[PDB]
């Protein structure tokens, strides 16, 4: 919840693979074949409001394989709309 690893599985891969689908979408690097995703795949909770303060949604950063290049994709979930989107996708990046 605060800056925590999430497991990588069937969730995971499924925003990992919309993120690469958003990119291939829109075809800033083309269009590149989702593998998987891998460590580290870390996610927030983020806040709004300011002052008082309020949750208003979550982040994930996670590094993603797509045609065997790994990208580092940012992703935001909207509490609200309950909606997830691409905040950005860096890379290709290499493991360290």
Do not use: H
């Not at 982040?59 to 065997?68: F, G, I, K, R, T």
């Amino acid at each position: 919840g605060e800056w925590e690893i999430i497991d990588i599985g069937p969730f995971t891969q499924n925003l990992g693979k919309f993120a690469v689908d958003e990119e291939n979408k829109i075809g800033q690097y083309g269009r590149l074949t989702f593998n998987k995703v891998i460590r580290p795949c870390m996610k927030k909770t983020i806040y709004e409001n300011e002052g008082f303060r309020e949750i208003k949604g979550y982040e994930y950063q996670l590094y993603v394989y797509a045609s065997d290049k790994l990208f580092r994709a940012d992703i935001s979930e909207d509490y609200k709309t309950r909606g997830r989107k691409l905040l950005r996708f860096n890379g290709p990046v290499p493991p360290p």
